[PDB]
Amino acid sequence: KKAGPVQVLIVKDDHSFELDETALNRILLSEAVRDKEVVAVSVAGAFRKGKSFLMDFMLRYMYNQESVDWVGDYNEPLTGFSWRGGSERETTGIQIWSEIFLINKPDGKKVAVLLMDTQGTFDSQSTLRDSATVFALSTMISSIQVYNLSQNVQEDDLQHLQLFTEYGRLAMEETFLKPFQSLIFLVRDWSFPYEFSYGADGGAKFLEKRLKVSGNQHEELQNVRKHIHSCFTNISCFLLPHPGLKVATNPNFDGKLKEIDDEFIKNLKILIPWLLSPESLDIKEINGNKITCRGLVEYFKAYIKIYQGEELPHPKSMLQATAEANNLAAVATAKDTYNKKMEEICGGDKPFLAPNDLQTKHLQLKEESVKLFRGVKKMGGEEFSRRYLQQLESEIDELYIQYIKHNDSKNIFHAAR
Amino acid sequence: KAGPVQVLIVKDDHSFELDETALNRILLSEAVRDKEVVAVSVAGAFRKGKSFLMDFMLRYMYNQESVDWVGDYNEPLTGFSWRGGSERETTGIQIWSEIFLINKPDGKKVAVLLMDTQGTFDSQSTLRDSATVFALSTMISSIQVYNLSQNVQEDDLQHLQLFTEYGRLAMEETFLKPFQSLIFLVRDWSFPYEFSYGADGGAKFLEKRLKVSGNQHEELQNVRKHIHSCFTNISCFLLPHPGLKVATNPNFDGKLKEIDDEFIKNLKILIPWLLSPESLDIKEINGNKITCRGLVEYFKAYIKIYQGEELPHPKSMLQATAEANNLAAVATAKDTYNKKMEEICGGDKPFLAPNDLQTKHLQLKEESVKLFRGVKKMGGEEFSRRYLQQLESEIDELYIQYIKHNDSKNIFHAARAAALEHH
Ligand SMILES: Nc1nc2c(ncn2[C@@H]2O[C@H](COP(=O)(O)OP(=O)(O)NP(=O)(O)O)[C@@H](O)[C@H]2O)c(=O)[nH]1
Ligand SMILES: Nc1nc2c(ncn2[C@@H]2O[C@H](COP(=O)(O)OP(=O)(O)NP(=O)(O)O)[C@@H](O)[C@H]2O)c(=O)[nH]1
Ligand SMILES: [Mg+2]
Ligand SMILES: [Mg+2]
CATH class of the missing domain: 3.40.50.300 (P-loop containing nucleotide triphosphate hydrolases)
Incomplete structure (x- = not known):
């Protein structure tokens, strides 16, 4: 009342x-x-x-x-x-x-x-x-x-x-x-x-x-x-x-x-x-x-x-938000670097590569992208960056699978004639 | 002193x-x-x-x-x-x-x-x-x-x-x-x-x-x-x-x-x-x-x-969040384009006539653009405009590479067509 x-x-x-x-x-x-x-x-x-x-x-x-x-x-x-x-x-x-x-x-x-x-x-x-x-x-x-x-x-x-x-x-x-x-x-x-x-x-x-x-x-x-x-x-x-x-x-x-x-x-x-x-x-x-x-x-x-x-999207602490942006940017940079360098090797206008040699190049380029990702300073923590490093490695593995198929087609399409 | x-x-x-x-x-x-x-x-x-x-x-x-x-x-x-x-x-x-x-x-x-x-x-x-x-x-x-x-x-x-x-x-x-x-x-x-x-x-x-x-x-x-x-x-x-x-x-x-x-x-x-x-x-x-x-x-x-x-230079809370929101959206929208292009012109897929392939790309690019625009982001379309531009530009670069992969499947397409057309 x-x-x-x-x-x-x-x-x-x-x-x-x-x-x-x-x-x-x-x-x-x-x-x-x-x-x-x-x-x-x-x-x-x-x-x-x-x-x-x-x-x-x-x-x-x-x-x-x-x-x-x-x-x-x-x-x-x-x-x-x-x-x-x-x-x-x-x-x-x-x-x-x-x-x-x-x-x-x-x-x-x-x-x-x-x-x-x-x-x-x-x-x-x-x-x-x-x-x-x-x-x-x-x-x-x-x-x-x-x-x-x-x-x-x-x-x-x-x-x-x-x-x-x-x-x-x-x-x-x-x-x-x-x-x-x-x-x-x-x-x-x-x-x-x-x-x-x-x-x-x-x-x-x-x-x-x-x-x-x-x-x-x-x-x-x-x-x-x-x-x-x-x-x-x-x-x-x-x-x-x-x-x-x-x-x-x-x-x-x-x-x-x-x-x-x-x-x-x-x-x-x-x-x-x-x-x-x-x-x-x-x-x-x-x-x-x-x-x-x-x-x-x-x-x-x-x-x-x-x-x-x-x-x-929700607001996050100052360090956390900058941290995500830091890592999201690094993942994209590392992945685009791997991708650009793979295209130079097995793009459409490039010659067929022996599979094992394609694999050897892939492994080298992948490791260079991992090193690149790791060498960028980021807030906050190598342990904050684990989830993103792991995402990078798996997304690169996924890209490589596409590159194999593209490489194989250069040999396959010609065999069928 | x-x-x-x-x-x-x-x-x-x-x-x-x-x-x-x-x-x-x-x-x-x-x-x-x-x-x-x-x-x-x-x-x-x-x-x-x-x-x-x-x-x-x-x-x-x-x-x-x-x-x-x-x-x-x-x-x-x-x-x-x-x-x-x-x-x-x-x-x-x-x-x-x-x-x-x-x-x-x-x-x-x-x-x-x-x-x-x-x-x-x-x-x-x-x-x-x-x-x-x-x-x-x-x-x-x-x-x-x-x-x-x-x-x-x-x-x-x-x-x-x-x-x-x-x-x-x-x-x-x-x-x-x-x-x-x-x-x-x-x-x-x-x-x-x-x-x-x-x-x-x-x-x-x-x-x-x-x-x-x-x-x-x-x-x-x-x-x-x-x-x-x-x-x-x-x-x-x-x-x-x-x-x-x-x-x-x-x-x-x-x-x-x-x-x-x-x-x-x-x-x-x-x-x-x-x-x-x-x-x-x-x-x-x-x-x-x-x-x-x-x-x-x-x-x-x-x-x-x-x-x-x-x-990693310190940014205002909005700035930092907005960049993360946009970066994630770009990545996701771009990945959607890639996956769907691979179903159309991946290495294990048959050759596409350059005009068919063009209209699929234009269809899928627009789907990715609209996917990008649909996600809620701090803070504004104005902040996102440069990221949308980056997305479109990057998709255009993928499309160029897809053209090259597609051409390599049938290099003689245009030349054979011109010959059969005369006959
Ligand atoms: N220095 C100062 N203290 C003030 C002023 N006005 C009120 N206070 C004192 O501030 C204290 C908190 O009062 P309160 O109104 O509960 O603040 P609040 O912002 O509601 N607190 P809360 O966020 O926890 O609800 C009290 O001790 C009050 O006497 C002011 O203008 N200056
Ligand atoms: N409320 C309050 N004022 C204080 C206190 N100590 C000093 N002041 C007052 O704070 C004012 C600013 O003093 P100053 O030492 O210049 O502060 P500052 O942090 O060095 N300022 P700046 O960052 O701009 O150099 C002065 O008017 C001073 O009298 C305190 O404990 N409480
Ligand atoms: Mg109160
Ligand atoms: Mg002072």
Whole structure:
């Protein structure tokens, strides 16, 4: 009866994902909201950075919109989505709030507002596929994604965003429009207001310089930025002050405003409506169509269904992915070398060779391809490269069988006359 | 006067060069030439307090015989350049001009080198820029302080694996571990009620964070196993937040009077812990202890490798995955063409009229192209366009060879036809 967080996407110990359809259906398919267009707000990013903490202040705003003091009473504990200190991850999978909010757009549109809290990336229990799936899904479902970052916007942040969004793209319909809508770079604990002011305007100037594409820029840097711009219709940045050392280090801290830095609260009171004001709420769109709560449930099911199978390629650790590419490239190089040299010997316009001599040449050329494959430095491991070396040897054996038949025909076809 | 010396330069065109004259001036002096060397380096993400830390290491190295080495509380912090702001400061690799001569417990007189490095992941650097600095600083130092913020996350572990693997590949083959001491320094640790500030809380924390289990997922296991196999001594120190003045006040100067006391307390444990003569390990490479002169030779050799050898250069996660996806698809699509052409014009198959053979090839080539296009790949058709072009070009080359094999089955086809046509 009382409102609370609802586990909607479950991530199990075996790294499998399961959707709680009953709960999702309960919330988004009720008669009161099912036919309404939907605004979905999500927060995502690294674990332990205050994502759920933030969402709970968004809840205070949603519940007390017409009040000037929505931020709460100063002795009131912060509740909603579960948050706490400690070095271990808290939120898992994807949670939504059980109460859908009905908000009047300035035109008169009665839209429904969904709030989505997510499992943090880069925890020690999770595989990269786990983190990417949760990040992609929230981005594919939300119309406003708050990318929660610590201290700065680093190049590895941009490359992770790129990886995660591209993974989302893969499971989506082909489209001629931008795949996603609003992205907010929220920088927590910004330490340089004297370089860029706290808030949206300092954020805007900061992010502008961060994502700017220039002709002098190395292609690797250009491309990640181009990808990001291509993915989102609106991109903004908000620079938030540190909430104070007590918020971060006191195990008894409760979310009470009286224990939070004043300049934080001041910028917080600007941040939330800036994200969530009736003016700012963009209705979810997928490939050119405004999605209702009913439609969102459908896409949520279809998307997770794709991530549950093996139709998509999955993201892998940095060393593992480079390693595969290293080996796949080496296998192709070694095989093409063997092949080119065999054609010089038993191509169609070359004379028939005695079988034993063909075999002797094959064995020499094969061994040279094996040596070539082995001499290329690859990440990561001669033991990672075993499966690929073995594939190379067997694929070359298969090619040689074709070459025997080709060689034999030069003798056979002539005998038949 | 002593000051920081720029030794490794990263050019604005992303190539690498060593300032050999600067290096020789320092490490080839008659005083230190043949001294066994200890090299202390700090590496990690930009703007995290690396240079700042090293300047406190400088104070210790200069005032060991003093009661209070940490300094007067009203004295500014100098040495390696540091500042606030969100833009990176340190570039390439710099070292301190003064080599410190210290006596080890066993009575050796070793030379001590301090090395400050360019922070990783700035927006000016390619991944290869960041990887090369990190790797070299690891390959040169006997003690690598890995400087992190707030936590040891999984992306930090994967970056360390990526960077150390890149270093390892440019090293002489060995059966021993490639490196020596690694310290996970966690800046702004927020949970002393869970793991204490300092080396003991850090030890217990990192023990759980890096523990290998044969039951956890392969990729979690393998990053951990890689890190353990790379270093002979791995440690962890949890440092408190220095206070908001240090992090946020533009007028902050490094004066201890403006730094949180808890940080100072732990800083005064950290530095002697890192730099105590008992624990200062002498640089070894491939089982041999290295002198100062010998360190320079290795620096030049290592640098040369990154300049001119075939190495698997680090790529962004998307880039790497996308290449693998495309390479596999090309291979598969190409193999499908080959197999099906062999059913049509393999050596044990009859001659085909050049026009029949042409239309089979055109049919099968299109089937392979569509096979290639049908497979889901990171990331995009644009990324794949060059690979699709490569596939089509390679299939065209196979077709040319198939034409030659087919002709050899009936060389006289055209000539006999022209003769029978006249008759
Ligand atoms: N330094 C800092 N700490 C913050 C900030 N906001 C909240 N915290 C603290 O961060 C800790 C984690 O809060 P939480 O909201 O649970 O973070 P989370 O991102 O949801 N974690 P998880 O990924 O594990 O779900 C709490 O101790 C909270 O007080 C902030 O802006 N800066
Ligand atoms: N939050 C926090 N800030 C710190 C800490 N130590 C130093 N700082 C602040 O960090 C800022 C950057 O210092 P600096 O030593 O230049 O960092 P760096 O890692 O060398 N930067 P770069 O990689 O760009 O050379 C300074 O404003 C300094 O006051 C710390 O432990 N925590
Ligand atoms: Mg959370
Ligand atoms: Mg620096």
